[PDB]
Design a protein around this ligand. Structure first.
Ligand code: HEM
Ligand code: HEM
Ligand SMILES: *[C@@H]1O[C@H](CO)[C@@H](O[C@@H]2O[C@H](CO)[C@@H](O[C@@H]3O[C@H](CO)[C@@H](O)[C@H](O)[C@@H]3O)[C@H](O)[C@H]2NC(C)=O)[C@H](O)[C@H]1NC(C)=O
Ligand SMILES: *[C@@H]1O[C@H](CO)[C@@H](O[C@@H]2O[C@H](CO)[C@@H](O)[C@H](O)[C@H]2NC(C)=O)[C@H](O)[C@H]1NC(C)=O
Ligand SMILES: *[C@@H]1O[C@H](CO)[C@@H](O)[C@H](O)[C@H]1NC(C)=O
Ligand SMILES: *[C@@H]1O[C@H](CO)[C@@H](O)[C@H](O)[C@H]1NC(C)=O
Ligand SMILES: [Ca+2]
Ligand SMILES: [Ca+2]
Ligand SMILES: [Ca+2]
Ligand SMILES: [Ca+2]
Lengths: 249, 141, 142, 312, 82
């Protein structure tokens, strides 16, 4: 697994198949990643849109429109959230019918080993806002280096010890940070994710096996280059529940 | 992110702007309205005629908000808490408009203070205005 | 579309611009304010610091060329879509410059026009200038 | 261990008598948390390094984040003690701190502090300069008010009768901006005994240098020039022997009543005057800030500045 | 759901109950379909449904809802998106 058609802000021209676009019933765009023939990954915050969180997932499922490949529509069958969503924003979505894997629709398979080592360079692609805060018409992809966890905790919460934490997020909103997360800094040209790229995979290209691995799902896209770090949920820490949910369905 | 030199440039530029900030803000509002009519949808109860005192006061309020933000460049989210909540949930202003307004504001400065609007100061003002816009639009939902 | 008053104002104001400086200044401003645009201009050598891009002759030459294209567009206001078709194909096929960067160039260009004109850039003519930069950005898009 | 093998050091500072505190224990270097850190800890520290009279204490990221274990936290120390490790503490290596709470200290031995005025009309009028670690710098004017000017004037030893802020006739300085946001209450013996922002991270620029003008009160004169009478015209100020005008940043009839009252010309009517004669040009100006209106003189008006800005 | 401080039993300020206490509703996003469902829920004629509080006074306490959208199909107010 892990063979794109072309390995390679810059407009994508045949490099990121796993990406998927979602729009709520009140016209806000978000991202998602293809994990297999019929299952996706997304952030939980992309599901509680324009309604109270007290609602059930059955109410969420039919209100979200989903595009893959080159504006190819797909229908959602079920949406299942992680039982501890308050501290890990993973959310999985099931397609109405298994997709026909082709060059424009193809999953990204999950890490057998952690890759969130400081300095590692990965790829992030998304349909999020742009420099003028308009949703990008064409798919965008950026390159980000993994960043130290302690520095990220200091950046968003000040101190590592829980008793001494106090909010200091430069963009107002505070991300969910714990053992199930890792952070990444800006690119070389000061490129960073903004609104709507949540849910997009942090892809690492392993040369030994010549394979692309989804290392994390972006869970904080409000940085918009104002904050210095973006926050992702580690797939390795979520692998087991993913396997169990897929097997159970 | 705003680098310390970037903060010094922003501080110097907004010190140089002086008391003309209210007039510049009113001009920026009018200019944004005229260039992009679609941004008038959020002011249905507003007298948008030439020389209107309503838009003058609104521009003065925006300029005062930005001056307060500059004074607290190190703790911007707390300075703009009320305005962020107002623009995020109550009014539901789209993110795009903010960038539009920023550009308008910027051009206004360029029209009135060409001498001080050097490229470095341009970069600094753009970064500061982008930070303000991101703070105000962060909780959009 | 442009009303006759806007057409007259925009043409008269553009008649007072200079080719060799304003376009280069606009391009330098884009390089300095949005770093990710340097990837395309790597051919021009050192673009690491503001004074470097401001002091680069190649930047001024390319500014002259883009301003010439803008003047041609102004001379073809009615038929902008066909006027820039070749440039649209060029940027879409060989460079992969996203459609937003064209509008970024338009905004920085408007900024430097304000910088040069001063008080003379009244909002009514700025509306027309915004319309023309929007037109050229859309035409170049795809 | 009786404490003989322990050693202590100051790192990443301006010189040996300033910087982050580190101590060696079990062959490992470490830092001390700033929890419950005060000037007593600073004196204890600048009693053991032979640098005396601890000037200031710091916290968090003043000198940069350190490395290694953390030994002390939440210490209570008196103002006189042989060494830092004799104080009462919960325990060695027991802490709830992280390296964003490291402690640093600046002593007097390396800090050859001195204050001076330069580039002014009179011996003790003009731009303030502070010497720190052998380098001269200025003070940002943000938060610079009459009490701070009083403290500085007393420090240099010239009249404290009238002590105004502003660098009269002085040009922008070059070098460091050592001080900012000084918050003297008006009775301290030197400007650096007051509370003030750290010495590192200032966003001021050299157009903002602070200064002071100290006078006995017998050398400030105020006049109206241009017009048919002594009671109408442009307001001019002769302070020391330097002539200048007043900027109308906030000029209103409220302060014109004070000025007219001072000259004994009655009450203020109009903020203009017939152009009878011609008045010469001057480059130094005076700036006022919202006089209440019932003051008996313009000199009693709160935080008036004598130069150091522009009326463009 | 109740209507208070109005001309009749069929018009006035609208109140909702939660946790044991009553509270008001914000008019923003309150359209004719919302009034239609509010009238339908209560035992009141539904031929004509209009927005606004008639000659009623200002509210008191907490505001317990805002920006609802019922679309006219949901039998009761709290079944709508809120
Ligand atoms: C730099 C960006 C902005 C700043 C600093 C800002 C600041 C402010 C301030 C200070 C107020 C007055 C709040 C009060 O009086 O309680 C306000 C209100 C308002 N703003 Fe903004 N604003 C910004 C962007 C925008 C944009 C882009 C729009 C729309 C396109 C907008 C639309 C409004 C509206 C409709 C109001 C309500 C006015 C009223 O109800 O009378 N604002 N804003
Ligand atoms: C929006 C209005 C634009 C106009 C009117 C325009 C016009 C032109 C023209 C006429 C050329 C031909 C130069 C030659 O043949 O030597 C050119 C080339 C080029 N343009 Fe654009 N362009 C625009 C936008 C952009 C933008 C936004 C970018 C990048 C951010 C860009 C990047 C380039 C590059 C890299 C070249 C080739 C330079 C070289 O390699 O020598 N263009 N453009
Ligand atoms: C706004 O409008 C409504 C509609 O009129 C007002 O309700 C009415 O208020 C008056 C007081 O001015 C009540 O009159 C009283 O009626 C009883 C009937 O037994 C009588 O004992 C009293 O002597 C007096 O006449 C009236 O009943 C009441 N309702 C009606 C249907 O007329 C309401 O007070 C106004 N204000 C607000 C805040 O809603
Ligand atoms: C501005 O400052 C200069 C500083 O030199 C002033 O000249 C000084 O005047 C005092 C008082 O007589 C003398 O002690 C100094 O020796 C003078 N310095 C000289 C002459 O170089 C000067 O008067 C001021 N000038 C203006 C235009 O305000
Ligand atoms: C959720 O957190 C609780 C905390 O006790 C833990 O027991 C449980 O295993 C967690 N569930 C998952 C799916 O990780
Ligand atoms: C001047 O007026 C202020 C404002 O009422 C008052 O507090 C102050 O005491 C007055 N000063 C004198 C000397 O009467
Ligand atoms: Ca502490
Ligand atoms: Ca402690
Ligand atoms: Ca200042
Ligand atoms: Ca003070």
């Amino acid at each position: 697994c892990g063979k794109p058609k072309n390995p390679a802000h810059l407009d994508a021209k045949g490099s990121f198949p796993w990406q998927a676009k979602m729009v709520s019933h009140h016209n806000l765009t978000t991202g998602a990643t293809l994990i297999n023939e019929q299952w996706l990954l997304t952030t939980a915050k992309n599901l509680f849109l324009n309604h109270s969180e007290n609602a059930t997932a059955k109410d969420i499922a039919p209100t979200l429109t989903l595009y893959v490949g080159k504006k190819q529509l797909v229908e959602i069958e079920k949406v299942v959230l992680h039982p501890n969503y308050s501290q890990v924003d993973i959310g999985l979505i099931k397609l109405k019918q298994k997709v026909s894997v082709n060059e424009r629709v193809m999953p990204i398979c999950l890490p057998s080993k952690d890759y969130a080592e400081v300095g590692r360079v990965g790829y992030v692609s998304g349909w999020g806002r742009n420099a003028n805060f308009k949703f990008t018409d064409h798919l965008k992809y950026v390159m980000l280096p993994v960043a130290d966890q302690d520095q990220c905790i200091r950046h968003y919460e000040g101190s590592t010890v829980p008793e001494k934490k106090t909010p200091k997020s430069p963009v107002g909103v505070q991300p969910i940070l714990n053992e199930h997360t890792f952070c990444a800094g800006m690119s070389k040209y000061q490129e960073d994710t903004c609104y709507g790229d949540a849910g997009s995979a942090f892809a690492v290209h392993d040369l030994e096996e010549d394979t692309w691995y989804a290392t994390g799902i972006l869970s904080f896209d409000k940085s918009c280059a104002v904050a210095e770090y973006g926050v992702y949920v580690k797939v390795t820490s979520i692998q087991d529940w993913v396997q169990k949910t897929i097997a159970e369905n | 992110v705003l680098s310390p030199a970037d903060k010094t440039n922003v501080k110097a530029a907004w010190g140089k702007v002086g008391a003309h900030a209210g007039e510049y803000g009113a001009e920026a509002l009018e200019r944004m309205f005229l260039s992009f009519p679609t941004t008038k949808t959020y002011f249905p109860h507003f007298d948008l005629s030439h020389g209107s005192a309503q838009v003058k006061g609104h521009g003065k309020k925006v300029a005062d908000a930005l001056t307060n933000a500059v004074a607290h460049v190190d703790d911007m989210p707390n300075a703009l808490s009320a305005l962020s909540d107002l623009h995020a949930h109550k009014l539901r202003v789209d993110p795009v408009n903010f960038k539009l307004l920023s550009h308008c504001l910027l051009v206004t400065l360029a029209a009135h203070l060409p001498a001080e609007f050097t490229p470095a100061v341009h970069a600094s003002l753009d970064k500061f205005l982008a930070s303000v816009s991101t703070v105000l639009t962060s909780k959009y939902r | 579309h442009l009303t006759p008053e806007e057409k007259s104002a925009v043409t008269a104001l553009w008649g007072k611009v200079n080719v060799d400086e304003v376009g280069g200044e606009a391009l330098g401003r884009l390089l300095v304010v949005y770093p990710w645009t340097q990837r395309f201009f790597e051919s021009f050598g050192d673009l690491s610091t503001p004074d470097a891009v401001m002091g680069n002759p190649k930047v001024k030459a390319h500014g002259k060329k883009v301003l010439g294209a803008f003047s041609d567009g102004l001379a073809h206001l009615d038929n902008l879509k066909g006027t820039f078709a070749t440039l649209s194909e060029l940027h879409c096929d060989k460079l992969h410059v996203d459609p937003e960067n064209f509008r970024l160039l338009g905004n920085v260009l408007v900024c430097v026009l304000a910088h040069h004109f001063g008080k003379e850039f009244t909002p009514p003519v700025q509306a027309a200038y915004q319309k023309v930069v929007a037109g050229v950005a859309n035409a170049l898009a795809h | 261990s009786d404490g003989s093998n322990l050693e202590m050091r100051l790192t990443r500072g301006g010189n040996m008598c300033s910087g982050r505190i580190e101590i060696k224990f079990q062959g490992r270097w470490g830092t001390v948390c700033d929890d419950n850190f005060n000037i007593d800890h600073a004196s204890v520290i600048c009693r053991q390094l032979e640098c005396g009279s601890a000037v200031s204490f710091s916290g968090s990221s003043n000198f940069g984040e350190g490395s290694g274990p953390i030994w002390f936290d939440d210490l209570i120390c008196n103002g006189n003690e042989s060494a830092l490790w004799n104080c009462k503490h919960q325990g060695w290596g027991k802490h709830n701190c992280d390296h964003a709470e490291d402690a640093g200290v600046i002593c007097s031995k390396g800090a050859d502090l001195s204050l001076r005025l330069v580039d002014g009309v009179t011996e003790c009028s003009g731009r303030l300069e502070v010497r720190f670690q052998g380098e001269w710098g200025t003070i940002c004017d943000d938060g610079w008010d009459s009490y701070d000017a009083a403290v500085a004037c007393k420090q240099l030893g010239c009249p404290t009768a009238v002590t105004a802020i502003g660098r009269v006739n002085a040009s922008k300085g070059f070098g460091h901006i050592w001080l900012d946001s000084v918050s003297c209450q008006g009775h301290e013996p030197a400007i650096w005994q007051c509370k003030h922002h750290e010495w590192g991270k200032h966003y001021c620029n050299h157009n903002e240098d602070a200064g002071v003008t100290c006078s006995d009160g017998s050398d400030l004169e105020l006049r109206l020039r241009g017009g048919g009478s002594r009671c109408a015209g442009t307001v001019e100020v002769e302070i020391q022997r330097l002539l200048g005008k007043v900027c109308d940043r906030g000029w209103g009839l409220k302060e014109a009543d004070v000025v007219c009252r001072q000259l004994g010309c009655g009450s203020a009517l109009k903020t203009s005057y017939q152009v009878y004669s011609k008045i010469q040009a001057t480059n130094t100006w005076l700036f006022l800030s919202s006089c209440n209106g019932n003051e008996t003189s313009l000199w009693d008006c709160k935080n008036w500045q004598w130069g150091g800005l522009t009326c463009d």
